[PDB]
Amino acid sequence: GRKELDSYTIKGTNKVVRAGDCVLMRPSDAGKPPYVARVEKIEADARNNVKVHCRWYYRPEESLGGRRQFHGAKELFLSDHFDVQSAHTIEGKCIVHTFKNYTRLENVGAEDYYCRFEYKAATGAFTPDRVAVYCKCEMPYNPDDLMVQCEGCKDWYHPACVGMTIEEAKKLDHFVCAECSSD
Amino acid sequence: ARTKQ
Lengths: 183, 5
Ligand SMILES: [Zn+2]
Ligand SMILES: [Zn+2]
What we know:
The structure holds two protein chains of two kinds. Chain A is mostly beta strands. Chain A has two domains: 3-127, SH3 type barrels; 133-180, Herpes Virus-1 (2-Layer Sandwich). Chain A is built from two helices and 14 strands. In chain A, the strands form four sheets. In chain A, strands 4-5-6-7-9-8 form a six-stranded mixed beta barrel. In chain A, strands 2-3 form a two-stranded antiparallel ribbon. The chains are: A mainly beta, B little secondary structure. One zinc ion (ZN) binds next to loops of chain A.
């Protein structure tokens, strides 16, 4: 049979894994960046070697559409793929923030990830269905991309989309869109 | 102005 375990400590590494935490898993293949899974259940086998029940986060590439324009570098999709893996497969814990708490980060580390979509793998479906769009390029926000906010419309714009490159945009003390100064 | 990162 199997006992269910409250906590796992990885490799005496001062790191404690509990259900609900997000962790990284070594791929067998050398090239790949580590997989990112949410631990849902920890349990010890009959012979007392530990195993974990996993929900997978999908990278945009694994996903239906592939990486898109607005998909950030650390975009993940919570899947509905489940699995079970040896807990020796775990390397370190990582964090997968909500979109908003990601945007709030003082600065991003390899540790840090974010998710704004649940992705059904068999149907290829995405929840939610609607995205919010910005600028007059009218694209969804990509956190990697720098955006500036007019003080009139208080809409957000890409510097290039309004005809300035990034480092003058950094210089702007005050910004008003051209559409505010017209007609 | 206010920027987003
Ligand atoms: Zn734009
Ligand atoms: Zn404006």
